[PDB]
Amino acid sequence: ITRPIIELSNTFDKIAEGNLEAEVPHQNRADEIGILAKSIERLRRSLKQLADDRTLLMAGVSHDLRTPLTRIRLATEMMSEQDGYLAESINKDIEECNAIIEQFIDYLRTDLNAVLGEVIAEIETALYKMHPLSIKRAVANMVVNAARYGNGWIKVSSGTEPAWFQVEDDGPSGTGLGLAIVQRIVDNHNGMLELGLSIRAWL
Amino acid sequence: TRPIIELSNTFDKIAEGNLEAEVPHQNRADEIGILAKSIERLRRSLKQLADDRTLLMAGVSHDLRTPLTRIRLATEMMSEQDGYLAESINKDIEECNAIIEQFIDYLRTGQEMPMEMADLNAVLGEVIAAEEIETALYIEVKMHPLSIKRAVANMVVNAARYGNGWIKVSSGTEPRAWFQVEDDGPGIAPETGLGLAIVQRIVDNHNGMLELGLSIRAWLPVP
């Protein structure tokens, strides 16, 4: 029973790396290996369902917050003119709420030239197994950072060497969360992140 | 055989939520060592993900509590003419704080007495003895009493919030568990809040299934 144990080890290895689509072998036997295998299958199913519903909690929070925060937004429109700065302040705070929630959910969510071309629609372009939405979000966050701290230009470029896609700005939580999102996205595709402010991503 | 049994029990303890349990036989030069290493890798992965989830969730909850506090401060500098506005906004902020507090209160109770064998009608009756409710119950399952309690609680609360009048809680069996809450309110489209998401997460923790139809039924494994 050495080989089945080794295969189960392989199963644990695959599950540990995020592969919840992998078949669990040796489920059809009445010995200890069978029991273990069945347990592994149950865990795999649970982990997959949980993986799918990961966003659901924060999305629920946003949903429940959507009604009262909107009523507050409405209340600021029937305020006096003397309290304009107050209404503006409140609105900015609500906007901050939105930014935080959306960014955290974006984190929990975690052809090149095609999607790179898609995100585009001042931006300068020098173009040459994936998750299109993930890459899209990554480029979005990179551009957001480059705009947030780079005063003016933003250069998005491609190329090849063996996949290389890079955003470069002209500049001298929040931002680190976005960078963490980019990092997670590029780590999902077995890639590498490269700073130099220039952000290059390999695939 | 024996090390396989030990690793089996350990893995059972990990699957039921205990990510701090030590994995034995990790330092062996046979296949048992390989298996133990793999299980340890899984445990490290799950623990890392969970801890990072808790940390980031706490941080984000706080960061959300920040601008909500600023708005509450802002209504204290409004004119006397806009008193009713400030009043309303204060009420809404109270609601928001209630929501975030619910989120935190849920994320606080991690794992306790792992998974025992409790009676469904017992905990259902417990939730019933808290808050018109009509009961048509039918049974023991492996679970966590507090989690299920929270689920039923949130479902009843939601059914009260959206169902104008009655709330019906029922049990029964199929090849084996289902508890269902019904209201008389508008369903979701002829063609979900924090509570329902919490219910979903809880029933997903117990390898179950959530089914809407508004009538929300939750399934749980038995043998």
Side-chain angles (χ1 to χ4, degrees), chain A residues 1-3 5-6 8-10 12-17 32-33 35-36 39-40 42-43 46-47 49-50 53-54 56-61 63-65 67-69 71-72 75-76 78-80 82-83 85-86 89-90 93-94 96-98 100-101 104 107-108 173 177, chain B residues 1 4-5 7-8 11-12 15 31-32 34-35 38-39 41-42 45-46 49 52-53 56 60-61 63-64 67-68 70-71 74-75 77-79 81-82 84-85 89 92-93 95-96 99-100 102-103 106-107 142 162 192-195 197-198 200 204-207:
Chain A
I1 58 180
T2 302
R3 188 97 283 169
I5 290 176
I6 301 175
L8 284 183
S9 304
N10 301 332
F12 273 113
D13 287 335
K14 295 172 113 90
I15 295 184
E17 294 178 348
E32 298 80 49
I33 299 194
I35 312 297
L36 183 59
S39 307
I40 297 172
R42 290 208 298 279
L43 181 65
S46 297
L47 288 184
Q49 182 69 22
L50 287 172
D53 295 314
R54 223 150 261 175
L56 241 182
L57 235 64
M58 257 299 163
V61 169
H63 176 78
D64 283 350
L65 286 182
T67 295
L69 286 184
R71 285 184 284 186
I72 297 174
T76 59
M78 46 194 305
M79 287 173 60
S80 49
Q82 53 190 342
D83 295 347
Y85 70 105
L86 282 177
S89 220
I90 296 178
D93 291 311
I94 301 176
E96 190 182 4
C97 287
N98 284 323
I100 300 164
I101 299 177
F104 187 49
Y107 176 86
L108 286 177
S173 70
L177 223 196
Chain B
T1 299
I4 301 177
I5 295 177
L7 284 178
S8 298
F11 172 70
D12 289 334
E31 57 270 43
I32 304 300
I34 311 179
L35 184 60
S38 62
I39 296 181
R41 230 233 289 203
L42 178 63
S45 221
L46 294 185
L49 294 177
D52 285 314
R53 167 180 174 78
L56 238 181
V60 167
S61 301
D63 284 346
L64 276 182
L68 292 181
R70 287 180 183 183
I71 304 176
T75 66
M77 296 192 62
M78 293 173 62
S79 57
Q81 299 187 343
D82 297 344
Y84 63 113
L85 269 358
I89 300 179
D92 292 293
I93 293 176
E95 186 185 3
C96 296
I99 299 161
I100 296 183
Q102 183 182 19
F103 188 58
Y106 171 73
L107 287 180
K142 46 170 191 174
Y162 291 98
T192 87
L194 221 192
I198 291 178
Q200 179 72 49
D204 287 344
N205 283 337
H206 300 81
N207 320 331

Side-chain angles (χ1 to χ4, degrees), chain A residues 175-183 185-199 201-202:
Chain A
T175 88
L177 223 196
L179 264 53
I181 295 177
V182 174
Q183 180 73 249
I185 290 168
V186 302
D187 283 344
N188 285 340
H189 304 80
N190 315 326
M192 183 182 182
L193 202 59
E194 180 187 285
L195 273 65
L197 159 256
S198 136
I199 307 180
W202 304 79

Side-chain angles (χ1 to χ4, degrees), chain B residues 173-174 177-179 203 206-211 218-221:
Chain B
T173 184
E174 216 60 34
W178 60 269
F179 92 86
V203 302
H206 300 81
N207 320 331
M209 181 184 182
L210 201 60
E211 182 184 284
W219 301 84
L220 293 176

